[PDB]
Design an enzyme around this catalytic site. Sequence first.
Site, PDB file in Angstrom:
ATOM      1  N   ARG A  75    -129.889  33.979  10.816  1.00 57.14           N
ATOM      2  CA  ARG A  75    -129.727  33.307  12.084  1.00 57.14           C
ATOM      3  C   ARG A  75    -130.740  32.156  12.142  1.00 57.14           C
ATOM      4  NH1 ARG A  75    -132.010  34.668  17.914  1.00 57.14           N
ATOM      5  NH2 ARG A  75    -130.874  32.988  19.014  1.00 57.14           N
ATOM      6  N   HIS A 119    -131.618  26.080  20.678  1.00 55.76           N
ATOM      7  CA  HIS A 119    -132.800  26.944  20.724  1.00 55.76           C
ATOM      8  C   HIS A 119    -134.006  26.122  21.215  1.00 55.76           C
ATOM      9  CE1 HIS A 119    -134.422  30.976  19.048  1.00 55.76           C
ATOM     10  NE2 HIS A 119    -135.426  30.420  19.702  1.00 55.76           N
ATOM     11  N   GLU A 164    -131.519  32.515  24.921  1.00 59.02           N
ATOM     12  CA  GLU A 164    -132.353  32.866  26.069  1.00 59.02           C
ATOM     13  C   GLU A 164    -132.350  31.823  27.219  1.00 59.02           C
ATOM     14  OE1 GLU A 164    -136.384  33.918  24.647  1.00 59.02           O
ATOM     15  OE2 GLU A 164    -135.520  35.788  23.940  1.00 59.02           O
ATOM     16  N   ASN A 290    -131.661  39.997  22.625  1.00 56.38           N
ATOM     17  CA  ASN A 290    -133.002  40.040  22.044  1.00 56.38           C
ATOM     18  C   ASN A 290    -133.765  41.101  22.801  1.00 56.38           C
ATOM     19  OD1 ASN A 290    -132.126  37.753  20.617  1.00 56.38           O
ATOM     20  ND2 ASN A 290    -133.473  36.320  21.736  1.00 56.38           N
TER      21      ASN A 290
HETATM   22  O1  LIG Z   1    -141.589  35.327  21.470  1.00 57.55           O
HETATM   23  C1  LIG Z   1    -140.934  35.796  20.305  1.00 57.55           C
HETATM   24  C2  LIG Z   1    -139.583  35.084  20.137  1.00 57.55           C
HETATM   25  N1  LIG Z   1    -138.755  35.548  21.279  1.00 57.55           N
HETATM   26  C3  LIG Z   1    -137.785  34.647  21.898  1.00 57.55           C
HETATM   27  C4  LIG Z   1    -137.456  33.297  21.231  1.00 57.55           C
HETATM   28  O2  LIG Z   1    -136.065  33.218  21.030  1.00 57.55           O
HETATM   29  C5  LIG Z   1    -138.214  32.998  19.935  1.00 57.55           C
HETATM   30  O3  LIG Z   1    -138.089  31.570  19.747  1.00 57.55           O
HETATM   31  C6  LIG Z   1    -139.665  33.539  20.063  1.00 57.55           C
HETATM   32  O4  LIG Z   1    -140.437  33.024  18.987  1.00 57.55           O
END
Ligand SMILES: OC[C@H]1NC[C@H](O)[C@@H](O)[C@@H]1O
Length: 443
Positions: A75, A119, A164, A290
């Site tokens: 990913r 992202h 997210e 996540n």
């Molecule tokens: O905080 C850990 C990790 N969690 C969420 C994010 O998608 C990722 O970019 C981040 O590094």
Amino acid sequence: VKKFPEGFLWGVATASYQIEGSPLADGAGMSIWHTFSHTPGNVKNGDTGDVACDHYNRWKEDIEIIEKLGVKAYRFSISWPRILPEGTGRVNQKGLDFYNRIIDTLLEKGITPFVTIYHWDLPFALQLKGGWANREIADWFAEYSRVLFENFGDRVKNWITLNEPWVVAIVGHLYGVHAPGMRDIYVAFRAVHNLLRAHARAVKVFRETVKDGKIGIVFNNGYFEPASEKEDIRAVRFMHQFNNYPLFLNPIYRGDYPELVLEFAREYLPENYKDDMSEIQEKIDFVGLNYYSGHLVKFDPDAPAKVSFVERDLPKTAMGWEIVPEGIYWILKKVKEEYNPPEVYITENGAAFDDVVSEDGRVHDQNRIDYLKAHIGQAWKAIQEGVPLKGYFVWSLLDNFEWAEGYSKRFGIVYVDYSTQKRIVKDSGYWYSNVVKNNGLED
Ligand SMILES: OC[C@H]1NC[C@H](O)[C@@H](O)[C@@H]1O
């Protein structure tokens, strides 16, 4: 022994701005994370993504590590401003070349690409026009998605619109801790709404351009528990609805925001927000969840949302995040119960610890192994109780730029020595390699 279904997808995960470096190379436009991290005070130690893991140059070597480890899926994300430097209009062929090489290499070595379209590295040029606050981002995002679909959709078949979006909206525009660094509750809920509309427009274009693929969306999730058996239960109900997948999945599946979100935030949403809800209900193929952490929660009359966290004496990661593996089971069961999506993936799970290279030249991160093992175990459980979990992705392949924490937080199963760019596979990496080969746990 805990064996997973045949064909289960074991993956690792990264993001463009966190690993690539070279943000202005080959005609790329600036992103909001470039300008945010170049502003004094926003990121720990004044770290930026200028160099990061230098993946922009070392991409082939990193993929060879994924191959050597036997990991079946990767990913990764695409930098919007590498592709369209001004956000819309002009397409930068060199940006496409860079992802084309990564895509072809992955397929050669039989790794399945999962591409995150967004992202967090919005083109700076679009932020000047309001970014996620501007309704027009639904168009801009659609045009960007279309470019990606047309160029890559012949080979890439698994797509994620947004990573997210709660973080994007709230941490970017209410808390001001992430780019673009704003603190306005009405802007932050307009961003929530526009993220949904942009997501739905991207899915719509996907049905037109990639007729044999699958597309989803990824949410951050916390396992929230009440401090007392008392309106403590309700503050937990609020946090789940606001901070977890329902904020977006109630709109996508049921055509409105969750009840407790409307009671808290209706004043902050656009006047006729309901007019957009039928378009927002565009059918998705999977939900990505996540998961990192659990939190004890109490009603508090004097907190911003009528809610505060209370510290517990539990083992914590270097982030200070409480380790609660049963949270990943809870959230997988709850998502089946509330919305019953056809497929689910764990798109990120992992931890930060204070890794060091021993004299023996190895990184003995037994604490990361314990973490990963306990969570993979819990996900096994949900499968046995019928959750259509099709895959699991460790965050992260590499130690990388951890947003406002900079380089000081290491999430990788591969260590990066930033002074040389040397990669050192950690014990957790060797351990996961064995999990993947065996298609599950054994001890
Ligand atoms: O905080 C850990 C990790 N969690 C969420 C994010 O998608 C990722 O970019 C981040 O590094």
